[PDB]
């Protein structure tokens, strides 16, 4: 089951709320209000502006509840822009070791990016129409692909499928040109 979380209205892909109006949506803080104003009933909501559902941030809470509720595909919207600590809080979540063993998939999506946390191992990467660039950001991580503090463009802006093997852990970022 796929879960769509909305925790803001900044940088949202176009028509995301109308093209996906009948999917499972979850409100996070202010995202809840936006969903209601768009005629969408949230499966559940978290954060003020909730607590009786069932140390942590509202988004960490909402995602944890999604995971516990069996969702395997979790896409987070409205988590980039404005206050950046909120965006960093999101990246933290993706890193929780608890979501490592599980066969879960969480990603932050905005009108220009798609962020995922690729852990130690080997994964495949299919091409995409709107997302030409790919970049890996270590969270010592050594990697091997089909073309090969640290601040190098070595594993940044780069363009079937390919293999990505990590001999630590990184954040995979796909972005539009």
CA 113 to chain centre: 9
Give the three-state DSSP class for 34.
helix
Query: Under a CB-based contact definition with an 8 Å cutoff, are residues 131 and 159 in contact?
Result: no
Alpha-carbon distances, residue 76 vs 62, 66, 120, 147 (angstroms): 10, 11, 23, 30
One symbol per residue from 89 to 108: x for binding a second copy (CB under 8 A), - otherwise; what is it? -------------xx-----
Answer for which of 65, 105, 135, 175 binds Na ion (CB under 5 A) is 105
| CB of 82 or CB of 121, closer to Na ion | 82
One symbol per residue from 43 to 62: x for binding a second copy (CB under 8 A), - otherwise; what is it? xxxxxxxx-xxx--------
For residue 48, the minimal CB distance to a second copy (Å) is: 6
| Contact set for a second copy, span 128-157 (CB under 8 A) | none
For residue 149, the minimal CB distance to a second copy (Å) is: 35
């Amino acid at each position: 089951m796929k879960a769509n979380l909305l925790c803001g209205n900044r940088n949202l892909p176009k028509h995301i709320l109308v093209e996906h109006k009948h999917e499972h949506w979850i409100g996070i803080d202010r995202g809840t209000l936006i969903l209601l104003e768009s005629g969408i009933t949230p499966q559940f909501a978290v954060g003020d502006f909730e607590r009786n559902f069932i140390d942590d941030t509202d988004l960490a809470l909402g995602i944890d509840q999604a995971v516990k509720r069996g969702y395997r595909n979790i896409d987070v919207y409205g988590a980039t822009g404005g206050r950046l600590d909120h965006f960093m809080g999101a990246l933290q979540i993706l890193e929780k070791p608890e979501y490592a063993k599980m066969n879960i998939n969480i990603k932050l999506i905005d009108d220009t990016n798609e962020i995922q946390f690729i852990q130690k191992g080997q994964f495949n990467v299919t091409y995409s129409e709107q997302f030409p660039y790919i970049s890996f950001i270590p969270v010592y991580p050594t990697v091997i692909s089909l073309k090969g503090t640290l601040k190098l463009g070595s594993t940044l802006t780069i363009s079937s499928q390919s293999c990505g093997n990590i001999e630590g852990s990184v954040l995979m970022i796909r972005s539009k040109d």
